[PDB]
Amino acid sequence: MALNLQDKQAIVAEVSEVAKGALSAVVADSRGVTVDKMTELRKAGREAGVYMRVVRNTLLRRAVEGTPFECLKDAFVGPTLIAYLMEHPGAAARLFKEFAKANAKFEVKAAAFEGELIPASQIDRLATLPTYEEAIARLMATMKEASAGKLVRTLAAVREAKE
């Protein structure tokens, strides 16, 4: 290891993933297993990569105190055990799901998704992101307007209104 010369290191070096941070997630991992690194690191194979890091650095005094790069409301955002996660390339979508559709399956606590940066707020997960590049969600998103949204009601008077 090393003192300040090493402490400062883990800081700025990784805090760069905060200044120029794509997405953002804070998940504790009490009772985490190796699959913990056989997942966010496995999905990094044929659907991710070295573009993701969850360097458990909840040293707070290091992680939290180490975020002068504007991330207010975080003097609270850094409680107990933590394992921050950030992105560099790619979009700012998916990622939340790697956690949302993993930790939801036991896989240790998920900090109930305390939310992180980007919009900069508090706790209460969202998902308006992973719907990206799933353009067909913007396709049927018109609900055929005329069609479907019609053949669903304007023609429901027959299979549900003839008495």
């Binding site: 699959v35 056989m38 690191l41 496995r42 194979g45 990569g49 070295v50």
Partner: protein, 141 residues
């Protein structure tokens, strides 16, 4: 995945399935028959070739037989058919034995697709970078 329920890996060659002299009564004893470990093995082994190492897991429950799902082979045994001499170690690093460079064993680091904890398609090349040095084989890379 879970952890451990029942699985091993003992074998000499695919050129001869379910060996009789080798392992013998040492190829499964907790739900593994010895006259059946050749009806689920050669069911897909005879679909590529016979003569190379084939380890595998052994999902065991309590319903007569069992179920398995093997994968990529070791890149150390491929040095008897895709590298040089018949043996391997023996003479370690005491006198430059065989010699494999950057070119050879290249695509041998391309066969293990899903089975390679080396996300970086390029970096995953450093892994097998040793599956041919357990006997001393300087690389002319």
């Amino acid at each position: 995945a879970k952890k451990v329920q029942a699985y091993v890996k003992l074998q000499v060659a695919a050129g001869m399935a379910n060996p009789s002299p080798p392992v013998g009564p040492a190829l499964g004893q907790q739900g593994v028959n010895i006259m059946e470990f050749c009806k689920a093995f050669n069911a897909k082994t005879d679909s590529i070739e016979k003569g190379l190492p084939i380890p595998v897991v052994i999902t065991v429950y309590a319903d007569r037989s069992f179920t398995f799902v093997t994968k990529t082979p070791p890149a150390a045994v491929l040095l008897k058919k895709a590298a040089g001499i018949k043996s391997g170690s023996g003479k370690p690093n005491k006198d430059k034995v065989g010699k494999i460079s950057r070119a050879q064993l290249q695509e041998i680091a391309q066969t293990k697709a899903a089975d390679m904890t080396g996300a970086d398609i390029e970096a995953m090349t450093r892994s097998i970078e040793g599956t041919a040095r357990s006997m001393g084989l300087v690389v002319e890379d």
